[PDB]
């Protein structure tokens, strides 16, 4: 289906073989087979292919080697809070001619820029990545929409899949069907939440490799999706800067209108009901222990905050008050008594420079996008860890 005037999706899905016929209905019957999805080989192939696609897509684009210079920076917002992350900066670019240096200005985010070494609280600034590695901006034709991908085995091999609805990732499946190609899974890049994923069929599934070891990561597969809105409201403008012979740089030029906070919106009642049912499914795995929903442990901004992208811009959302409250008893929230329209709103921040996959991949400077960004999504699953404290004899924390 993904064949149009545009072929430069970052996952390069146009080059794949088109699946002409219907998907196979090849149920076997009288077949039992043991499965271990924590030992599956295909996930490592998927991770390697995503890394290789990222490298081969970011390879021919424009580099940012000459831009890493001394930056003289000052305040950009007239405020003193909320949206104070904007800063203004000036520098010296190189024109087409080598001997002609030109004074230039650009706007930046506060997480992108770093005050220079041995500063006397001065205006001297630099980029974050300049003492780590190089960086390349993304080409503006590149579209980051998660087009679905069907993995297929070669001829002479086969793909067996489980059909048992309560299959929690281990154990033998009574209902096993073969198929030529996998279904339309999506390469959605996110952390701490699953977006646009395949829904659980009838029951909220908890998958963990050991369930008592806290080093294992609990995968929570929700039965019903939770719809989430995310937006950056303020009107951004894109400017262009000539750097070197025949290649251009893009940056944030100006903001039009009153600046408002980038945020996300979640229906609070459905989220609490989902957390309540997850607490039911977890307390039936951990009897006589009240669980607690608490914020994640402290660490990096990319690790603590829920990170994703919609459009070409990248979002990092606070989510501390999202994971709040304790579930005890049996269905204590009672859903609701009235027609509540309560929406929990998460504040979010935006980075331009990302060292995605923890530096295994490559640096990218995401170019800014004019206008505004709005994006809608379904939360279908959660990534949780068991904070197994000593005083958790009855009050467990996740």
């Amino acid at each position: 289906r993904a064949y149009e005037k545009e072929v430069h999706n970052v996952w390069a899905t146009h080059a794949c073989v088109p699946t002409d016929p219907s998907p196979q209905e090849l149920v076997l019957g009288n077949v039992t087979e043991n499965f271990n999805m924590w030992k599956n080989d295909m996930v490592d192939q998927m991770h390697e292919d995503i890394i290789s696609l990222w490298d081969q897509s970011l390879k021919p684009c424009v580099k940012l080697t000459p831009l890493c210079v001394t930056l003289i920076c000052s305040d950009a917002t007239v405020k003193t809070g909320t949206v104070e992350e904007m800063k203004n900066c000036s520098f010296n670019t190189t024109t087409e001619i080598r001997d002609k240096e030109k004074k230039e200005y650009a706007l930046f985010y506060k997480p992108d820029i770093v005050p220079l070494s041995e500063t006397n609280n001065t205006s001297e600034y630099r980029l974050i990545n300049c003492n780590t590695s190089a960086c390349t901006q993304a080409c503006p034709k590149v579209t980051f929409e998660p087009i679905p991908i069907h993995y297929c085995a070669p001829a002479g091999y086969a793909i067996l899949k489980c059909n048992d609805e309560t299959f929690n990732g281990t154990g033998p499946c009574s209902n096993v069907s073969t198929v030529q190609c996998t279904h339309g899974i999506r390469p959605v890049v996110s952390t701490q939440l699953l977006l646009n994923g395949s829904l659980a069929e009838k029951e909220i599934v908890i998958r963990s490799e050991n369930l008592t070891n806290n080093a294992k990561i609990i995968i929570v597969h929700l039965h019903t999706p939770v719809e989430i809105v995310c937006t950056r409201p303020n009107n951004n403008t894109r400017k262009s800067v000539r750097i070197g012979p025949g290649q251009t740089f893009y940056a944030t030029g100006d903001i039009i209108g009153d600046i408002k906070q980038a945020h996300c919106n979640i229906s609070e009642e459905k989220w609490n009901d989902t957390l309540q049912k997850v607490g039911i499914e977890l307390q039936k795995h951990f009897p006589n222990k009240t669980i607690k929903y608490n914020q994640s442990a402290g660490g990096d901004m990319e690790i603590t905050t829920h990170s994703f992208n919609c459009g070409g811009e990248f979002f990092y959302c606070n989510t501390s008050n999202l994971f709040n409250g304790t579930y005890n008893g049996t269905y204590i929230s009672t859903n609701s008594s009235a027609n509540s329209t309560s929406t929990i709103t998460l504040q979010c921040r935006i980075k331009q420079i990302i060292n995605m996959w923890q530096g295994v991949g490559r640096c990218m400077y995401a170019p800014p996008i004019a206008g505004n960004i709005t994006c809608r999504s379904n939360i279908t699953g959660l990534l949780l860890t068991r904070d197994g404290g000593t005083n958790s004899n009855e009050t467990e924390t996740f």
Partner: antibody
Amino acid sequence: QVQLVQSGAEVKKPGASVKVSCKASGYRFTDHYIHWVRQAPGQGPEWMGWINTSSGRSNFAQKFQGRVTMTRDTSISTAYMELNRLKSDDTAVYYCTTGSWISLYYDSSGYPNFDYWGQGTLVTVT
Amino acid sequence: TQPASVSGSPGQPITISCTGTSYDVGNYDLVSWYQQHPGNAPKYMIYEVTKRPAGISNRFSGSKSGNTASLTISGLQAEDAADYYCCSYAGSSTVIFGGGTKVTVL
């Protein structure tokens, strides 16, 4: 009841500068944007710009760039207009208007909901 | 961008039109109407494309068709002889006015 006390009549020569006060009353002044409207005699309205009372962020018409500045403070609930280097056409009736409610999550500063009006003032250029 | 004058007997309805571009009228419903008696401050008449403020009678109503909008005055009296203005968000945090219409109540 909400009401905006504008300042008195200004009579001065061309090339001078005019500051006009607008004292708000009846509401918490941080809640709403402030716009200002000019009106030449025998002529309709004329928009200059707006000011965010929460943070002092302001915007202008393109022909009023540089000549105008806006300030405010919610400590005494007032906002000060300042027009510099007046011309002969700048003789007008000036109106303080309460804009829409100030939100945190959407740009409502451009909303043309001028709910309440000041009494007006006269700026005359001799 | 507004017709200069309109006339009408008391009791009959009329309409006042305003026509702009796609940028100011076509894109957004953020269009307002105001009235102004001579020797008086402009008065708050219509805020949304159709919504009336509290305290405003059923004399007036808002409407929009494509690139233009109109204030329909349902019935008339002499007190509606004031000037009328339309106003709109014009994009890029800019606010413009249509220009005016003198209502001449017969």
